[PDB]
Design a protein around this ligand. Structure first.
Ligand SMILES: CN(Cc1ccccn1)c1ncnc2[nH]c3cc(F)ccc3c12
Length: 167
């Protein structure tokens, strides 16, 4: 039993809700919140900008030190950093950005990072300003993640479409 509330169950291990991931993170305090990161951990907009703003820029400060030490992530890769006031940990995952021409096949590799964590609160990778089709992202999620994932979808219209079109 966990504290996630109001989710629709899609499969054995995938759940979905219309929610603001920032507000869901602050209420749940999950062990892991997933950020929709880029390779530079520059949290300027989309989910990343919202999560970083909610940490009063502490996420960005920590991320800049991470990059100065380790260099950029790989597209499809991830790193674990602090969850600050939102979660125990933040798993920064880099899905391909279609608006940069990155290979959509890397979306599966991106979701594989979720399997290293038993339970996660996450957005749909490569959705929003990353330019992928969220229906495809949901399909890859369901077909790749085996651990328990709670997907927060900000846009109510999109959510209804994701639920209604799910196979
Ligand atoms: C993937 N996105 C955004 C998105 C874009 C297009 C269609 C659907 N969703 C999110 N997903 C879950 N929670 C979110 N909180 C957000 C707060 C923001 F200020 C900006 C973005 C998000 C956000």
């Amino acid at each position: 039993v966990n504290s996630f509330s109001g989710y629709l169950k899609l499969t054995d291990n995938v759940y979905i809700k219309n929610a603001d991931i920032v507000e869901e993170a602050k209420k749940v305090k999950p062990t892991v919140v997933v950020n929709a990161a880029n390779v530079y951990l520059k949290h300027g907009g989309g989910v990343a900008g919202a999560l970083n703003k909610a940490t009063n820029n502490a996420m960005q400060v920590e991320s800049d030190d991470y990059i100065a030490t380790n260099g950029p992530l790989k597209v499809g890769g991830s790193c674990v950093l602090s969850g600050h006031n939102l979660a125990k940990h933040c798993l920064h995952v880099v899905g391909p950005n279609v608006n940069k021409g990155e290979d959509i096949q890397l979306l599966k590799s991106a979701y594989e990072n979720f399997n290293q964590h038993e339970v996660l609160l996450a957005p749909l990778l490569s959705a929003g300003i990353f330019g992928a089709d969220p229906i495809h992202s949901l399909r890859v999620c369901v077909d790749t993640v085996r651990t328990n994932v709670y997907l927060a979808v900000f846009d109510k219209n999109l959510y209804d479409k994701l639920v209604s079109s799910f196979l």
